[PDB]
Every structure is written in C-alpha cells, then in structure tokens.
Design a protein around this nucleic acid. Structure first.
Ligand code: MG
Ligand code: MG
Ligand code: MG
Ligand code: MG
Ligand code: MG
Ligand code: MG
Ligand code: MG
Ligand code: MG
Ligand code: MG
Ligand code: MG
Ligand code: MG
Ligand code: MG
Ligand code: MG
Ligand code: MG
Ligand code: MG
Ligand code: MG
Ligand code: MG
Ligand code: MG
Ligand code: MG
Ligand code: MG
Ligand code: MG
Ligand code: MG
Ligand code: MG
Ligand code: MG
Ligand code: MG
Ligand code: MG
Ligand code: MG
Ligand code: MG
Ligand code: MG
Ligand code: MG
Ligand code: MG
Ligand code: MG
Ligand code: MG
Ligand code: MG
Ligand code: MG
Ligand code: MG
Ligand code: MG
Ligand code: MG
Ligand code: MG
Ligand code: MG
Ligand code: MG
Ligand code: MG
Ligand code: MG
Ligand code: MG
Ligand code: MG
Ligand code: MG
Ligand code: MG
Ligand code: MG
Ligand code: MG
Lengths: 271, 46
RNA sequence: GAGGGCGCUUACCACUUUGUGAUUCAUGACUGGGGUGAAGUCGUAACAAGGUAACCGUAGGGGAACCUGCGGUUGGAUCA
RNA sequence: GGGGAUUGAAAAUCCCC
RNA sequence: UUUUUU
RNA sequence: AGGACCGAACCGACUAAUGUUGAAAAAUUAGCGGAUGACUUGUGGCUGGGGGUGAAAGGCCAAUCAAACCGGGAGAUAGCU
RNA sequence: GCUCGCCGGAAGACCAAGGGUUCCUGUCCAACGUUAAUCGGGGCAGGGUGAGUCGACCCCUAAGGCGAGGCCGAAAGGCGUAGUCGAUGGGAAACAGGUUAAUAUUCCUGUACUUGGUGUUACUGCGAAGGGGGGACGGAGAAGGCUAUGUUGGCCGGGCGACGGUUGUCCCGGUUUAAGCGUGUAGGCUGGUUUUCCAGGCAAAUCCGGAAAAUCAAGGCUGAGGCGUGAUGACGAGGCACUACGGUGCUGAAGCAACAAAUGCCCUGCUUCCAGGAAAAGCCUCUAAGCAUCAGGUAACAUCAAAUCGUACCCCAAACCGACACAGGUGGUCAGGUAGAGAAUACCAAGGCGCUUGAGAGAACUCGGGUGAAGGAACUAGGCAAAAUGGUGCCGUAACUUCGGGAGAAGGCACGCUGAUAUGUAGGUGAGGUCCCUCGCGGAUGGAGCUGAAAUCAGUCGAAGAUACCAGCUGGCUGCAACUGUUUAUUAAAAACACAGCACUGUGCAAACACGAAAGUGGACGUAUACGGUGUGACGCCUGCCCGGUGCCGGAAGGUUAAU
RNA sequence: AAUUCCUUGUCGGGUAAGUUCCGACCUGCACGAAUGGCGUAAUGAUGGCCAGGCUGUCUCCACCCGAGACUCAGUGAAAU
C-alpha cells in the first residue's frame, strides 16, 4: 500500500511512502546474515570508479537462496521481511527437515504458503523448476542462465520473464527489457511474478531520501569548466556541444554492446 | 587559526617512520641518501 | 450643631482617536464582448439532398463563417 | 493586362498574345 | 463560388 | 511526524566599525544564518600530480594550485633590461 | 597581611592528544622576561613519578595494511590465497581515608575483588583451529521508578552584637561515609518440564532446529534503587597542649528526617518508524580425533603467583599547533546557591584571577560609550550605521493558499507588594493507627506532617511592576529561485551548484561504464520496478513548426577503397 | 523584460517635484516552449520600490564617561 504525506512541511509534501503491513517488524534471522561495508563507488585502487555512490544507512546482508535446491523437501514460509539490498522483498521459509532459508518473494508470497523445488515440483506460484518442465506461457521468477548457476534474470520488484517457446533443448524467453533470448532449458526458474511491484510508485520527495539511500548528487557537465568535462563554459549556460560522456566518449545512441561471444543467445533485441 | 601542523606520533611514524622508509625500494633509497650525506638522524625516533 | 451649597471623586455617556476588517456609490490608463448604422473587404456556413443532411452536448484545430473527432436527436431529402 | 469562348454579367476554366 | 440600396 | 518553528552548546560566515610596520600572514567587537539533519565532531584508514578530489569555484591537494613540493637534466634558453 | 575588584557551564577542576622535567627545594640574575626584579615556565645544583585490580603490552576482530605458495607484468614491481597485522570498537579484578616540599584507586591504615599453578578432601565424562547459543548492535518518541544533588526543619557545637532593636517564630556553621558482601524491589522479557521421533547444522552431538504427544499453572531470566552490612571504624566544627609561629601532637559534638529533584540510572528497556541498523574473542553448551584405575571435569579450604612499560608537570593553556610568555586554534568529563523556560543571562559559592612597564595631565584629533532642545530620512548610491521592537497569558487576526500555511500577521488588555477566600487553596508527596494477608523491599483503609502554583476580591507605593541582564520591528507592491541544503579556506553565499520530480539514451550480466599495458577490482554479492550517460529541475496549465546543415541510428544494390 | 539601441518610449498610479518603482500598451534594435514557456502558496543574511514606528543619518552640533595623543621615568623599533 502506498500513501501520500500531508504537507506539514516542504520536503514532506511530495513524499509518497509504500508501506506494507504484512512485513516483519524488527531484526531479521540472524544466522542468515553477514557483513557488508560500503565502497564509496571506489575501486581496489581507491579511485572513484562509479560516481554518485557514498554515504547512506548501514545495511546488513541477507543470504537469499537463489539456486533453490533442497529438492523434494517442502517448506512453509514463516514470514515476509524487508531486505535493504534489493527492491525485492524477502521470505523466511523453513524446510520440513528443520532448515531455514531466505527466498525472494513472488506475487502471492503470504506466510502459511507451502513451497517446493525440483523436477517433480508442482507448478504453483513461487515454486522452482527446470524450465524443461514448465508450461510454455508461464510467467516465472528469478531465472537461471546456466543450469546450476543461480538465477539472475528478473530479480527486481515487479519483474518477470515469460517463456515463449521451447523448441530444441533451449527455451526462448521474453525478458522484462523486451529482448527475446534463448536459454538452456535445463535452467531452473521460479514460478510467478516477483513480489511487490508497488515499488515503481514511490516518490522520495526530498533530496535527503536519496542521500540516505547512498546517492550523492550528480553535477551536470555543463555546469563545469571545459578542463573538467567535455561540455561546459560559454559566459552563461550555452552548449553547442555534441552530447558525450565526461571521457569524450560519444553518447545518445551508441549501443556499446559488444559480445559476439553471446550473440547467439539473443534472438530479438529490445525496442 | 587552525594551522597545518597537527602533531601525531602514530601517524608520524607510520608515514615517515624507519620501517615505512625501509618497506619500499624507494624509501630504502632515501635512507641510503641520508646515510651517504652523513645525516645524524635518518628518520626520527625516541 | 442638624441640613444645604461649592469643591473633589465614581458610575452612565456625546464629540473625538487608533487598529483592522465588511459593504456600497462614483471613478480609472488600458482592455473583452454586446447593440446600431442605404449600397466597403473576404470568403459563402445555414435555408432545397444548401452541392460534406442538420443540430445539441463536448474536445482539439483554423484569416472567418467554421473544420475534424465521439455519442445523442430528427426538428432529413431519395423506391438508396 | 489584351482577344475570343463560356456566363444574364462576373469569378474560375479553355484556346490566341 | 457570387449576383448593390429602396 | 517534520532536510518543521523559536533558541544556547556546536557548525557557518550576511552587515558594519576597528585593525591594515594588526593581538592576528583573514581576527576582534556588535548584530547574523543553520541548529534531529543532505547535522556536527575524535581517532585511524584510502585516493598522488595532467593524478586525486570536487552539491563545480578551475575550488581544494601542508600559509602558493589554469597542473603541488624536493632533487636532477641545468650554467635550459633569453635577438630582452 | 588587611581591603577592592574580575571569571564562576569559567578566567574552576579532571583526562586525552601533544610537549618532554616546564614539577619540588634551594640558590643565582648577565643573557632570556616588551620596565625594575630581589621574582620567574631563566641559569646551576639536588630531589621527585612505587600498581594483580588505572593505562599499555595482552586475547579479539574493523576499515584497511602486509602476505608463503599463487596470477599477472620489459626490469623495477602490480594484485591476491592461507595466513598475519591494525583500534577509534569487544575481553578478569580495588574502594574509602590518611600521608610528601613534590607520588599515590600504586606508599600506609581499613576493608574487598579476579583468575591461573600446586596440594588435600569429597563429588564426576572430560576433550577441538569444529557445531549451536551468546557476545551483537539504528532513529525518534513517551512516561513511570530512582539516585546524584539541593532546600527546610530536627539535631549538635559556637553566638547574644562597633549604631535603635536582637535569649527568641533570632544569628553562623556542621549535619559526611566507598567498594565489596546480603536481600532481589520498581519494573522489563519469555509458559514451563518430560518422553519419542528426523531428508538440517561440510564429521558427530546428549546442543540448536523441525515434528509428535504427555503433563503442570507457576517457572526461569533480568533489574535501578532502598534497606542491612562493611563502619567497633573513617571523616568531622571545635577544643587542649606544645611550638624552629611553617605547623605537630592528642581529642572530639551532632552526624537524622520531610520535600524537591536531573540531560545520570532501570532503559543494550519500552512504544514506534523506516533509511532496516560491525566483526571476532572471551563466555555457556554440544559432541569429533582422543584419554577411559589415568588424565581431565565440579566444589570448598590451604598456599604460590599476577611479569614488563607508563605513572612528575602543563591541558581549551605562558608548557600543544600558531617565529613570540601572541586577544587565534585545540577532542572528551564534571556541573553548587537566588532569580530563569533554560548548559541563555545577571549576581555569588568552591576554586582562580586583576591580563609583567608605571606616574601625572585631563588639548586637537582618532577609538569605545552615555544624554540631547525643535525637527524627524531633509541623510546617503542605499535609512549603511544608529534608534526602535523585544516575556507570558488571554481576546483578536486580511488578501492569498499546494488547505500545513500566511500567524507570533496585525491589535489590543493584564502584569509589583499585602491582606483575604485558605493564619498555605487545586494539585503533589504520604507517616502514624486500623485491618487483611498468598507474610513484607506486601495490600488495603487511613489522612498527620511536608510542599504548593493559579484565580478573584479588596487594599497599597512609584513617573514607571515582562522595572536590570535578557529580549521579534511591523505593513504594502514586484524580479529570480520551489523549498532545507552547497559554494569561491583568504575581497563574490547568489539569480550560481545541488535537489525531489520529468525526459532522452546506453546496458541481458564475464552488463554497459570506470580504475589498471595485466592480474585484479569497482559497477553489484545488484540483474532492466537495476545500473550508467546527458539534459532539465517542486508543483500547476502546457511543451507548437522545421531532419536542409552538424551529430547520431538503420540500409545495402552500385561507385570508390587497405594490407595481400 | 536579469532580454529594448533610440530611452529618462507613451499613457495611467504614487510624490510639491519620481531617469527607480508599480499598471498598461507593444514600434519585441536583438522573448518563446525541458538551450523548457508561462504562472505559483510557502521558503530567501536574495534585487528593486513604498508606508508606519524610530532615531545625531541629517539641519547643527553640544555636553559628559572611558582608552590613546600630551609631560615624567624604564626599555625601544620600522618603512626610507
Ligand atoms: Mg540525475
Ligand atoms: Mg561555472
Ligand atoms: Mg566571468
Ligand atoms: Mg548567452
Ligand atoms: Mg468602469
Ligand atoms: Mg453553404
Ligand atoms: Mg453541407
Ligand atoms: Mg457527427
Ligand atoms: Mg528544523
Ligand atoms: Mg561574531
Ligand atoms: Mg534556530
Ligand atoms: Mg594552499
Ligand atoms: Mg622543480
Ligand atoms: Mg642541457
Ligand atoms: Mg640561468
Ligand atoms: Mg631586564
Ligand atoms: Mg614553579
Ligand atoms: Mg627555572
Ligand atoms: Mg612470494
Ligand atoms: Mg597484497
Ligand atoms: Mg591479532
Ligand atoms: Mg582503544
Ligand atoms: Mg600534584
Ligand atoms: Mg585443583
Ligand atoms: Mg562459534
Ligand atoms: Mg537523595
Ligand atoms: Mg548596640
Ligand atoms: Mg540552620
Ligand atoms: Mg597526576
Ligand atoms: Mg602577558
Ligand atoms: Mg594564548
Ligand atoms: Mg554565562
Ligand atoms: Mg534630538
Ligand atoms: Mg534624498
Ligand atoms: Mg540630498
Ligand atoms: Mg541596519
Ligand atoms: Mg541598537
Ligand atoms: Mg523589474
Ligand atoms: Mg534557493
Ligand atoms: Mg571569500
Ligand atoms: Mg562573503
Ligand atoms: Mg539514472
Ligand atoms: Mg537549469
Ligand atoms: Mg521619498
Ligand atoms: Mg514596467
Ligand atoms: Mg520543442
Ligand atoms: Mg532562452
Ligand atoms: Mg527554469
Ligand atoms: Mg538557505
């Protein structure tokens, strides 16, 4: 559920929260945690390598089972938590054999629900299953890319990949981005749409929110002086440049995409 | 006003200390130079 | 002496004063439309099947009447 | 612009300058 | 497509 | 509840006078902004020179920065004084 | 030595960082000291820092640093595995008093605590670089309990007034006590115990986890403070003695209560929110390889041990960074009395000070102030600067408005003291007594005593009662920018940057992009509801035409075209 | 007009008088749609303009309280 904030003060007037009751309150499941430590957007040579990264709240990491094995053993999702490291929500699961694990959080989620993964596995929202055994047309969560690896496609609040055709030993998928891409079919993949989706609708409302989210400000090239970024200068505003990256690297449609090594798998590019 | 020399022996030793000098081809070269000039205090100690 | 008057004092209150509002008349550079005016310009939308049937509601567009879109009406002509 | 056609006469339009 | 006033 | 209001600490630095061989190589005095936040601050760590860093001023990088400092090429070169 | 004055959330007092003998005593004065100097943070001697429990070393990890092998790379070297370092964080223990010229939680008195070795005696499955638990965690907010602390009285000792009064509802002061040990409260959290079973916990487990039943309702953690004890003592005004007039001996009164009360503590709690909040060791337990009369394990008592380094002094500064005995700079900890809303402020306490050139004079002029006839923005580029407003309560408050706002708009009235209602009220605290009781740090009923605003009425002094210090001026039009924010340390704080929001655009993950001739690494332990780039810059109404030129995308038929 | 040369544009308002202000026109030297356009409550040590209070800002100064300047003593510079 999303909420507007009364304007008892500017920098609140535009806020829009996305509050979810059915979330857990307070600390998460300790043993499934570990350190994180920010980076600053800086390398292992200490140089800023991605700009705009720094500050922001503390953040402890949840382990999150992506590969989804535990074949045969069902589980029962005890609750739904908040993960800080993703837009996605989280599901503490608990297996019959007495083992707990973190799993993403399909669109049905809900505590009480029953989960299961493996070739058998009944096709039900939130269950994992090599795609070979999944009706063509199904909508599918976090998708593995190489059978066994871990799942990497559609990990985000609201995402989902439709299977479109499975001729050959490969599946062809309609990614969220719109590209159509062949995949090994023996690749696992969870059922349903990834959880939340209200996400889109948040507003922040004030600079601070973003600040306390890890995002420093971005200074426009054109504000700078030539020596700094390819733009900038001119007595007052101006431009007359050819929109490029601060490293003279040309922009506005340049694709940069360059594989050959994975071309095959791309059936139809996004539009 | 706040001047530029804010003493600190921890950093002092860490940054220009004997072992830090000694911990690199070029530091080592510094000591060589000073020993060669006959300096009386290679690095700064107790 | 008692009482009284003058005075002083308290209440009520007329002028009068400050602040800020309501209302109403006259007024105003400039500006939008409306009405009137024997023979101006430009097109010619309606009246007949008015040469794209018309009109109402409504929204965008256009020197202008108006054009186009959507639903409704017939207060529409033809053996369609 | 001029000429003729066509108009009841204009305009448009066609042929001769 | 137009055909001044009474 | 709040980059909310008033206001010390604390962080800043809008006006003025004094100072200007100063008490001070940027301050004092009176007023001034912020003041639960994009707040402030201790210690320690990383980023190094056409390199860093920069809510961008060409600002900051040990009292200097349109390319630091130290040493060397080096008695650069100087149709100039 | 007597006064006077200044600071008193410091101009006091402690710690750190830094200094590094500046500390104490003598003694000297050239030079150092903005003068003299007899004095000094100067010279020269000499003295001075005493620890199981304060700190460090030390175990433990962070960021990050180093790194056998290793990958990389002309050489130099770059990066990383195991590991190994690194505190600003986690980890056993000591309080009160007394003493030196100068050291003390270190010496002495008194009284405690920690964990190890050895022994003896009973009682016993103990054991890992491993498993589990714990350690172990954000912000805001809201009271309850309490202590530190203070006020009044009681108590005790002392007092009876330089000038009218002052043996009483009078004056001054003191009225203090630690850890540890015992109790286990206010109050916070969680149902307990037993047996069976298991696809989990890299091996296993008697642990945790999961699942089954069975059986009890009260059980276990946690916890300020109080009370007791420590204290038979320490402290303690004041005495009585000696004095080499600095002080040294001996002695010793009362030593309670009510009220108020933190920003300390219970509270690593509670309620709640979102931005969702270190690691590891110690510690508890589980077992493995192991030892199985042993060895280890538990407990009480006895004993030995607890090293080494630091420990003077300056500390928001005359001892540090500022060339100086420099109005600058400098992290944390304490927090008394009256008035206050208060860590503002004014006056004081404890404590520390009068700023290391003075004496006169009492011009212009400059600096910093105080008052000002009439006038009152005439000033000037500009009301710069001055002047003015200045608390609380209550009534009252326009356009506009994104329905919060604008508002503290504006504008008014009240504000001292005394009496009364009420020799001190509403409120607050709460002792006797009475009873009850699962028995006391219990409950109830009780209202003594303590404490205490606010109102109204009535009276009264001055010119003036928010009587000082403190402490908004307000209003009307309009440019820009939404807003808080950021900026040219040192002539620019803004209309510049930023910004939430919008748009274009790239990126399918070994991503695009960036750091690096690489390995490696940031992006991201993310994955198109994400990540980069660029432009705009809240919100409202909206964003038209032009693809020639320049850039960019798509396109091959042909023409042209490199090495070969 | 943060854009406008001519320019103190012209009319309106305000003032005794107004090259600024506000309101209009529009003859836009040389506005205009995310090189965003045009509005906008609130915010602002932001620019422009007016009005009340208030005043040594000023007519036009005066007096007073302090620190220097001046004389004495000790020390004792500097720019040139
Ligand atoms: Mg951006
Ligand atoms: Mg610029
Ligand atoms: Mg310029
Ligand atoms: Mg320009
Ligand atoms: Mg009218
Ligand atoms: Mg018609
Ligand atoms: Mg028609
Ligand atoms: Mg129609
Ligand atoms: Mg605020
Ligand atoms: Mg100041
Ligand atoms: Mg404030
Ligand atoms: Mg500099
Ligand atoms: Mg050089
Ligand atoms: Mg040469
Ligand atoms: Mg030369
Ligand atoms: Mg002398
Ligand atoms: Mg001394
Ligand atoms: Mg000395
Ligand atoms: Mg090696
Ligand atoms: Mg390395
Ligand atoms: Mg270590
Ligand atoms: Mg430490
Ligand atoms: Mg001492
Ligand atoms: Mg033993
Ligand atoms: Mg462990
Ligand atoms: Mg008490
Ligand atoms: Mg007498
Ligand atoms: Mg008394
Ligand atoms: Mg000491
Ligand atoms: Mg001095
Ligand atoms: Mg000083
Ligand atoms: Mg004060
Ligand atoms: Mg006057
Ligand atoms: Mg004037
Ligand atoms: Mg004048
Ligand atoms: Mg002023
Ligand atoms: Mg003033
Ligand atoms: Mg203007
Ligand atoms: Mg702004
Ligand atoms: Mg400046
Ligand atoms: Mg400035
Ligand atoms: Mg982006
Ligand atoms: Mg802009
Ligand atoms: Mg005037
Ligand atoms: Mg105008
Ligand atoms: Mg456009
Ligand atoms: Mg423009
Ligand atoms: Mg704009
Ligand atoms: Mg601001």
């Amino acid at each position: 559920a999303v909420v507007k904030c009364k304007p008892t003060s500017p920098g609140r007037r535009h806020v829009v929260k996305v509050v979810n009751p059915e979330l857990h309150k307070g600390k998460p499941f300790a043993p499934l945690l570990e350190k994180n430590s920010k980076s600053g957007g800086r390398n292992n040579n200490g140089r800023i390598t991605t700009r705009h990264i720094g500050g922001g709240h503390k953040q402890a990491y949840r382990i999150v089972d992506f590969k989804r094995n535990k074949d045969g053993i069902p589980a029962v999702v005890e609750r739904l938590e908040y993960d800080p490291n993703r837009s996605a929500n989280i599901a503490l699961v608990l297996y019959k054999d007495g083992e707990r694990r973190y799993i993403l959080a399909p669109k049905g989620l809900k505590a009480g629900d029953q989960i299961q993964s493996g070739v058998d596995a009944a096709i039900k929202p939130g269950n994992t299953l090599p795609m070979r055994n999944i009706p063509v047309g199904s909508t599918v969560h976090n998708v593995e890319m190489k059978p066994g690896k871990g799942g990497q496609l559609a990990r985000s609040a609201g995402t989902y990949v439709q299977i479109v055709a499975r001729d050959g030993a490969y599946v062809t998928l309609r990614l969220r981005s719109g590209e159509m891409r062949k995949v090994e079919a023996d690749c696992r993949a969870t059922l349903g749409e990834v959880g939340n989706a209200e996400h889109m609708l948040r507003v922040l409302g004030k600079a601070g929110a973003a600040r306390w989210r890890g995002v420093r400000p971005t200074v426009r090239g054109t504000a700078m002086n030539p020596v700094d970024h390819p733009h900038g200068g001119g007595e007052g505003r101006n431009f007359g440049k050819h929109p490029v990256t601060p490293w003279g690297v040309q922009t506005k449609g340049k694709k940069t995409r360059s594989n050959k090594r994975t071309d095959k798998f791309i059936v139809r590019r996004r539009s | 006003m706040k001047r530029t020399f804010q003493p600190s022996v921890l950093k002092r030793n860490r940054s220009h200390g004997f072992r830090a000098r000694m911990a690199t081809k070029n530091g080592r070269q510094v000591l060589a130079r000073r020993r060669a000039k006959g300096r009386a205090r290679l690095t700064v100690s107790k």
